[PDB]
Symmetry: C2
């Protein structure tokens, strides 16, 4: 079997966030209210006159809002997209998925996603308590998940829905959110915010390599119509993850009471790093077969 | 907020198997084939004439099979019974489950279960490789799970289906498998078999405490149709976890080639520790209400 997978499985205890920083809760021990929750430098409307026209506390509420929103989206992605793909592999629904090495690598990844959800949930709860955020609108469904559910809606056969769920999860795990990497490195914000994202990023880098190996091994064992289905779904999943939907920015801005929110939003890199998914496509021998224009690899990757 | 929940949440990093023994895979290192997989002492037919009349390799294969069978059932219970209950709580479907302290304790439990699944899956794979078992027959449906399906068939809408899943999960997590506790302490079997079960038991002791606190809080916020449904549900789950299913014994014997497997099973304590479940019952004030005869606490 895959030497990459063997390596990753053996390294998991030395690498995983759950092992090496289970005590993340205690990181709020000596809290400093004076330090921002989110970096202005990565806010797209940061230097817009209408955002600058606001009062300092209003800008701070937007930053806090964007931090909480980012954590909400991470949790929804894990729960709705990434973990269901991993679960399908463990359920043995694809030929070749009964392999002990695939099962070890993916179950380890499932333990990691559980802990990621734990860390991001803690981040929301601590922020909401300490910033005294009593109530906040529960709204927008992920653009990525909306696209998934629409693809699946009329699909007759379970075998094909399984492919779609696998591909959506694979793309999620190989296309790193710019906010994850940018937040991870940021020294201007709450240290627990850059720490949680640093931890998640370390695990996600491994998850991307795992997914590339597992997807190659399963595609190899698939029959032609399964292979055909995987190929069709790739560009559709890729486009869903390339899609910027700034409905969340609007809500945050309106929440903070910023005048001209619709104007600021209607007015608008933070592109994902698609490097991993490009490697995935290469390992499947699909280089020329996928109709997707891959963005350049970010400096931070 | 619950002082129990608080203490268990803050202790989790020191307690959790996932933190303490993430490198469980490496425990197979200097592997000694001479050490048994499973203790004859806790095998219910160990002293049966027809078992004793079988060859030494046949009896050692049964022990291997029962160890693998044990692990298979643990994984199935976690995946089909315990995790769904915990997920339901995190899904916020029940009033009062939005509580951050509840959410931390239960999410930590979910991390634990994913790692328990990992440990047990590893034990199966490493045993199957080292004992050279290339072939193993399909296992029967869990008795506990078959009974769950039955209740869910009888009880209709989404709203009742949530309550049943919750109770099934709660009973599973508060009634400790005799085999869990007896394997954990066994000094004669593969060190990593007693280690995995020692680790799982340490976590499960905490999970039982977590579940009693959570279910109590969720019971308080339920509407009258819901409480009625939960109360009617407790004894059925409890009976389900108390009923013995001999079908998995008949498989290990009929696989290892032991003649008269039917008579052995025909001729056939490993009773769960219901202590945690009894506490759950009193915490709900259903002491007089529940028609279930709790066995005396087992010695272990
Ligand atoms: O930081 C993020 O946005 C992020 C979201 C999801 C995943 N994930 O699918 O595990 C990782 C990072």
């Amino acid at each position: 079997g895959s030497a990459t997978l063997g390596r990753l499985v053996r390294a998991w205890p030395r690498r995983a966030a759950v092992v090496n920083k289970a005590d993340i809760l205690d990181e709020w021990a000596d809290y400093d209210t004076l330090v921002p929750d989110y970096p202005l430098e990565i806010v797209p409307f940061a230097e817009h006159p209408l955002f600058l026209a606001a009062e300092p506390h209003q800008r701070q509420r937007v930053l806090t809002g964007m931090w909480i929103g980012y954590n909400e989206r991470v949790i929804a992605t894990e729960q709705l997209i990434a973990e269901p793909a991993f679960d399908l592999v463990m359920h043995g629904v694809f030929p070749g998925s009964d392999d002990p090495l695939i099962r070890k690598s993916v179950q380890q990844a499932i333990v990691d996603e559980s802990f990621h959800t734990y860390m991001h949930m803690l981040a929301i709860d601590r922020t909401r308590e300490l910033r005294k955020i009593s109530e906040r609108p529960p709204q927008p469904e992920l653009v990525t998940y909306r696209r998934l559910r629409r693809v699946l809606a009329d699909m007759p056969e379970q075998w094909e829905r399984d492919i779609a769920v696998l591909v959506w999860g694979a793309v999620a795990e190989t296309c790193i959110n710019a906010l994850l990497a940018l937040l991870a490195r940021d020294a201007t914000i709450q240290p627990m915010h850059s720490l949680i994202t640093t931890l998640h990023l370390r695990d996600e880098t491994a998850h991307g390599s795992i997914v590339v190996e597992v997807v190659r091994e399963l595609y190899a064992r698939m029959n032609e119509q399964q292979r055909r289905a995987l190929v069709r779904c790739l560009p559709i999943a890729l486009e869903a993850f390339a899609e910027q939907d700034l409905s969340a920015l609007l809500l945050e801005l309106n929440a903070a009471g910023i005048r001209g929110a619709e104007e600021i939003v209607g007015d608008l890199r933070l592109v994902r790093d698609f490097s991993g998914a490009r490697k995935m496509v290469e390992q499947l021998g699909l280089d020329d077969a996928v109709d997707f224009d891959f963005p350049e690899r970010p400096d931070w990757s």
